[PDB]
Symmetry: D2
Subunit: 160 residues, 4 copies
C-alpha cells in the first residue's frame, strides 16, 4: 500500500479522536523506503562528513550516494538550519532520500541530523548537545546521531 494511503488513515484517526500512537504498518513503510532507496543525497560541505554517512548507509541499502555542497550562509540565518539544509537539497537534486546535519534551532540549541523522503516528509531525526558540553570530535558525533536515527524507526546497523 502507498504512503499517501497509510497517512490518510492516521489523519482520519486524529479527526475521529481515536489515534493511539504510531502503528506497526507505518514503521514498516518507513523501513521499506530507506532500505529500497536507489538514490540518496547528503547535504554537507566537507569530504569527510560525507564519508562517515556514506559508509553507514551502504550497510543498510544498495544505493548510489552523492554529496551536495550547500553554501551554509544560506541556511544558518533561518529558524531551523538542519531542516532548511535538507529542503535546499530537495529543490535541486532528484533522489529518494535526503540526509542533512546542522544547528537544530536558535544559536546555542545544539545539533540535529534529519532524513527526508522525496516530498519533504520528515521520516526520522537525531540530536546532540552543543560541543561545548559533549566535547566529542564532529566525526564521532555524526556516527552516533545516524545510528540512533535509523534504530528508532527499526533499522539495525548490526549483522543479520
Amino acid at each position: 500500500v502507498v504512503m499517501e494511503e497509510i497517512i490518510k488513515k492516521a489523519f482520519i484517526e486524529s479527526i475521529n479522536n481515536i489515534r493511539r500512537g504510531d502503528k506497526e504498518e507505518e514503521l514498516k513503510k518507513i523501513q521499506e523506503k530507506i532500505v529500497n532507496a536507489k538514490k540518496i543525497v547528503v547535504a554537507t560541505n566537507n569530504q569527510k562528513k560525507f564519508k562517515v554517512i556514506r559508509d553507514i548507509m551502504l550497510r543498510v541499502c544498495n544505493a548510489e550516494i552523492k554529496m551536495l555542497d550547500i553554501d551554509t550562509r544560506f541556511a544558518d540565518l533561518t529558524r531551523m538550519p538542519a531542516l532548511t539544509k535538507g529542503l535546499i537539497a530537495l529543490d535541486i537534486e532528484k533522489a529518494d532520500l535526503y540526509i542533512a546535519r546542522g544547528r537544530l534551532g536558535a544559536p546555542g540549541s545544539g545539533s540535529m541530523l534529519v532524513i527526508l523522503d522525496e516530498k519533504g516528509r520528515v521520516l526520522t531525526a537525531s540530536l546532540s548537545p552543543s560541543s561545548v558540553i559533549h566535547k566529542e570530535d564532529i566525526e564521532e558525533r555524526i556516527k552516533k546521531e545516524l545510528i540512533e536515527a535509523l534504530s528508532r524507526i527499526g533499522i539495525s546497523i548490526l549483522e543479520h
Copy 2:
C-alpha cells in the same frame, strides 16, 4: 545582554565564514531564559501530560504554569505536529515559555518534546521512538524527554 544581540553576533559570524559552533554566552542565555521565566504555557489539554511536566519544571524555575483551553490534537494533520502545537499556544496566550509534546514528523516518526521562547524560537528538544518500540508508560517517557531537553543545554535537576 538581550537575546536579539546574541543572535545578531552569531548571524554575522556566519555571514563572514567565522562560525565555529555554539558559544558559551549562547548557552548561558538560554539557561537564564528558562530558570527566570515568570510564566509557562504547556501546549496541551490532557491532564496526565500536564502534570508530569508541571511537577518537573517546578524544580528548576519559579513560574506560574498553566495548560491550554482547547484540544491540541488537531495539530496532528500538519507536517511537524509537535512544533505546530507550540505555535498554536503562542497565538492564544502571553507567556515567557511554551512547552509542547507530540509526533516529530510523518506517522511512524516517533516523538518530539520542544521548548519555545516568547517569539517562537526553538531553544531545546528531545526525541523518542514509536511506543510500539520502547514499550513504556507515556508518563515515564515524557519524564525522560524533559530531563534530557534540560541537560543538553546545561540544566540539571
Copy 3:
C-alpha cells in the same frame, strides 16, 4: 530539461550575488508544469469553490481533477491556513498539482489562493481582501483569484 536544474542555476546566481530577478526559462518551466498536469487535487470541501476551479482549469489542461475527502477545517488553527491545506493534500494524494484556497495568515487578513507542485514548491498565488471590505459573491472572487494566479506566470485563459 528538468526542474531541479533550472532551480540550481538560480540558487547559484544568489550565492554569487548576481541574482537580478526571475528568468524567462523559469516562467516557461512553471507554465509547462501546469499545462501538462495529468492529475490535480483541489484542497477544499466546498463544492462551490471546487466548480469554479475545475471549470477554469479544464480550459488550460486536460487533467483528472478532484476534491479532498477529509475535513479541511482544522487548517484554520495554523499560521498560514491556505498553505497548510495544500500541504495536507500533498501528504495524502498522488498528483502533479495541488490548488488550495483559505485564510492568508492571522484572523482578519483576507484570502490566499495557492498552487503547489509534487514536491510542495509554491509556483504562484493571489490574494483577496476580507469580504467585510470587498463585499462580493464567493464564486466571483474565486474566479478573479485563479485568473490572476495563472496570468502572473504567463498563462493566458482567453479565447485564441
Copy 4:
C-alpha cells in the same frame, strides 16, 4: 481586548465548525496595531527599498523606522524567501511591526510584500508578477505593493 483573545475566539469558532470569513472586530485590531506602531523594522539593508517603504508608512503612522545592518539576501534559498526575511528581522530586532519584500516561492514565482507583528503573525501581504512580465522599476512596484497591502485591511492614504 488583547490580540491573543481575539484569535482564541476565532480558533474556537473553527473547532466547533461555525467559523465563516473575517470579523469586523479583527479588522479593527489590525488597523490599530499599524496606525499606533511605535517601532517599525524594514527587513533589508538595501537603502532604496528602505526609502520607498519608510516614506509610505509615514503617511499612516508616526513610528520610528529603521533598516537592518546585515544583508537579508541569505533568505533567497528557502521555500518562501519574503517570509524568511521577515523572520530573520524578528530574530535580531525588537519592534511592533516587521516589513519584508522578496521572492514569493520557487524561482519564477514573482514577489511578495508582507507585514508581521511582534510575534511573527502574518497581518497582510501583496504580490507582483516577475519583472520580465511587468517591466516596471523596483521602486515603483514596491510602492504599489505597499499601498495595496494597507488598503486590503482597510487603511487608506
